[PDB]
Amino acid sequence: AAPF
Amino acid sequence: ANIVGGIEYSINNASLCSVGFSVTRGATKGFVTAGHCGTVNATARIGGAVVGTFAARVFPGNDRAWVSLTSAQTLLPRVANGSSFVTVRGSTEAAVGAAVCRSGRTTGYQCGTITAKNVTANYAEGAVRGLTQGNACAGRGDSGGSWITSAGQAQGVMSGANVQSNGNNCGIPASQRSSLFERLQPILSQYGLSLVTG
């Protein structure tokens, strides 16, 4: 998961 | 500018994020958004004009911020859903299994259900703990945006998701999405903010  | 959950704003003329919710702190107007969107005192613009600055934020660990606006801004109890609006009625936290939607400048208004709470996201900057996960899709640019139930209960602000090469997780089945948001209630009490409702 990555920021957004 | 009219402050509506889900609309685009830029940070220091460079990144884009989405407005989470209109709030007040005494006589100050503001909106809550994601902490990773800007650092304290970063300038927020909506449609080319300066609307305020980042007053406080915590990222990573948590992922939260609020932007204090100038008096000229009009705070509205609403979240954008296409050309229509969802009225913000309060902030009762919904349980797992509840249906929820989210609004942001990249994918618009998307709905799904809450699948788990107290998830840790491991971002490049560090871990962010305590996030709720839903399977509504989202894309880069949606950060900071509103998560709200159809009944108008504000849930939190977009933090991150398992994005694919197209910038979003809308092309993979709901079952495989992990879209995470920061709960609204700790942000409101941490900064002494009151949600604008209608």
Side-chain angles (χ1 to χ4, degrees):
Chain A
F4 279 18
Chain B
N2 282 7
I3 304 307
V4 175
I7 62 173
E8 179 181 293
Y9 73 94
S10 58
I11 303 86
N12 285 341
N13 272 321
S15 299
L16 299 181
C17 274
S18 306
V19 175
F21 300 96
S22 300
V23 299
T24 52
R25 196 226 234 182
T28 310
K29 299 173 172 188
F31 65 81
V32 293
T33 196
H36 72 260
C37 289
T39 36
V40 174
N41 300 127
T43 306
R45 287 174 174 83
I46 293 176
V50 176
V51 294
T53 51
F54 272 74
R57 52 92 83 146
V58 183
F59 176 73
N62 302 309
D63 192 1
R64 59 186 64 163
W66 78 280
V67 178
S68 37
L69 299 169
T70 65
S71 317
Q73 309 312 319
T74 306
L75 298 185
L76 296 170
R78 306 184 212 286
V79 170
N81 164 16
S83 306
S84 192
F85 309 96
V86 179
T87 313
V88 181
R89 308 295 241 211
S91 59
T92 312
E93 194 171 322
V96 175
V100 65
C101 300
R102 48 149 299 276
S103 185
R105 52 78 58 202
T106 303
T107 61
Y109 189 86
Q110 298 297 333
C111 301
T113 60
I114 294 163
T115 53
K117 289 188 184 190
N118 224 275
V119 181
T120 299
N122 295 304
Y123 298 143
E125 296 94 346
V128 172
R129 301 192 157 92
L131 301 173
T132 306
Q133 175 179 282
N135 59 19
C137 73
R140 289 177 206 135
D142 286 333
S143 297
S146 337
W147 277 75
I148 187 169
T149 62
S150 51
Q153 298 300 320
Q155 301 304 297
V157 298
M158 184 84 218
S159 178
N162 62 323
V163 60
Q164 309 294 299
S165 55
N166 72 340
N168 61 67
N169 60 4
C170 299
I172 57 173
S175 51
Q176 282 173 44
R177 301 175 190 153
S178 170
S179 294
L180 313 168
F181 65 90
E182 173 78 316
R183 298 164 56 233
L184 183 55
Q185 283 172 13
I187 308 176
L188 300 180
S189 59
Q190 181 167 359
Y191 298 124
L193 306 174
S194 299
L195 195 62
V196 175
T197 60

